[PDB]
Design a protein around this ligand. Structure first.
Ligand SMILES: CCCCCCCCC(O)(P(=O)(O)O)P(=O)(O)O
Ligand SMILES: CCCCCCCCC(O)(P(=O)(O)O)P(=O)(O)O
Ligand SMILES: [Mg+2]
Ligand SMILES: [Mg+2]
Ligand SMILES: [Mg+2]
Ligand SMILES: [Mg+2]
Ligand SMILES: [Mg+2]
Ligand SMILES: [Mg+2]
Lengths: 286, 285
């Protein structure tokens, strides 16, 4: 009866969860913790306690998405430090990241009571999280099943619209919806495309000038997509195949990585094409 | 084209949708209800009942895709696990994607905003509970031997972990029911019985016992370590810890652990009996 009584207590109450338990499971997230919203707000003009919550939400989603992305990308370093999954393990990191996505979601109701507005906010959250995963899904798929699919520039841009555009739009849309009041989404869409291609570009260019981890990862980056379609079109069979073989080695060898970068530089002219593309895009936004 | 591109919703084809769905479709191939029966009392319209079932189906299967990665499991329902076929990266992303697909189905449940908020909050709260309990199960396993849970700590972990999906299904139906106590306590007790039975059987069916290989603080193991600790049985206690920490696939070593659980701590019988008393709480109500 003494036991049957503890069981009765147990099942008749909400699950027990201590502040100690919360700290233990939060380790991966606290480790990775170690200005766009402020800017955008100069136009949206949201009261400050709402702006603070939009900020917590975007911060939880961004950091959590990086913990998962680093496991998905086999990344050794993030923000200058060892990635959380190498310290705490893949199991804990995945579970904590996923836990934080749901804590982010919980914060959405601290933004308002107005049932019409609430439904819209939750839909924005749900929509863009679906987008982010669809984009991340193709990015990973192309990479891990190469050469099953060789994306074209159009396929890559559409992937970036889902992947990169997801948190940019989530941030912008939440803020527009909370604003006492045309949409800046097309501008944020462009801003995100620039950001991603620039990221892909400098990952190689910084290396060529002096880790180019995107090559080790085997990612179908913007310059890489140009190089593979360029080589196919121009009948450069051997170069097409060598770009593929190197990507598939998942190599950390610095000379093999530089070889691939110089093929992009001298053989396909993918680096110049990409630098030009980014310039044409910045010109458009300006 | 850049102007077209940025002025429209992101493009996503059904072909793209099929690509990303492979890891999930894979776990769907191997079959394996309580819901239909309970509706005899909740009486949800058939269309809402289908949606609740689909929500629970997406969450359950996706959660198992993740659990198998976290547990380094080579087989699920007698078949190779999705992460060994499509890779860990795609499997995690697909599973997480389906969590959000499940979230989206919550809106097709009702138009009434008072109700809608309540359903999202139920969905949110139980996915939080699910992760809290899974995070504690994973923590004890991976930080062993830092913390050895007591039976009370284990049952609290189970209420969050296993109870999460059971309560989610039940609370969604109770919120949606057009009919006039709650079945939560019962579903909570069913969850506990379910978990302890999964832990008990993993070993008795051997007596593969993958739980040993995983190093999980299962119900029987929790009894064994707190038993050996309580009765100053130092060497037996450490031996249990040594085998769990080995992460062994060795049939002989595992049988050696089960043997200790059968004959020294008598944890298998302690567990079988615990289950019976839980079943008696219901079969005596
Ligand atoms: C569904 C989760 C999506 C998270 C997206 C995180 C992208 C991270 C990178 O932008 P980074 O590793 O250079 O920070 P990516 O290069 O696309 O892996
Ligand atoms: C946050 C997701 C939690 C999902 C928990 C799934 C538990 C699955 C098991 O019940 P199984 O591997 O025996 O099917 P567990 O023994 O606890 O890993
Ligand atoms: Mg990455
Ligand atoms: Mg990535
Ligand atoms: Mg990058
Ligand atoms: Mg498992
Ligand atoms: Mg598990
Ligand atoms: Mg199990």
């Amino acid at each position: 009866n003494k036991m049957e009584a503890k069981i009765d207590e147990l099942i008749n109450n909400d699950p027990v969860w201590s502040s100690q338990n919360e700290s233990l499971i939060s380790k991966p997230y606290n480790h990775i913790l170690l200005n766009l919203i402020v800017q955008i707000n100069r136009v949206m003009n949201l009261p400050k306690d709402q702006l603070a919550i939009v900020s917590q939400i975007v911060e939880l989603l961004h950091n959590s998405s990086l913990l998962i992305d680093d496991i998905e990308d086999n990344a050794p370093l993030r923000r200058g430090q060892t990635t959380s999954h190498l310290i705490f393990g893949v199991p804990s990191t995945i579970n904590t990241a996923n836990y934080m996505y749901f804590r982010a979601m919980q914060l959405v109701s601290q933004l308002t009571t107005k049932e019409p507005l609430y439904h819209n906010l939750i839909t924005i959250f749900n929509e863009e999280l679906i987008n982010l995963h669809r984009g991340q899904g193709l990015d990973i798929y192309w990479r891990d099943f190469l050469p099953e699919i060789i994306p074209t520039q159009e396929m890559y841009l559409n992937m970036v619209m889902n992947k990169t555009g997801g948190l940019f739009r989530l941030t912008l849309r939440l803020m527009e919806a909370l604003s006492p009041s045309h949409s800046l989404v097309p501008f944020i869409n462009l801003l995100g495309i620039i950001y991603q291609i620039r990221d892909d570009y400098l990952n190689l260019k910084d290396f060529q000038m002096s880790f180019a981890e995107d090559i080790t990862e085997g990612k179908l980056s913007f310059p890489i997509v140009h190089a593979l379609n360029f080589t196919k079109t121009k009948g450069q069979t051997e170069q097409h195949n060598e770009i593929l073989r190197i990507l598939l080695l998942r190599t950390s060898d610095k000379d093999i990585k530089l070889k691939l970068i110089q093929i992009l530089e001298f053989d396909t002219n993918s680096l110049a094409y990409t630098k030009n593309f980014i310039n044409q895009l910045v010109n458009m936004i300006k």
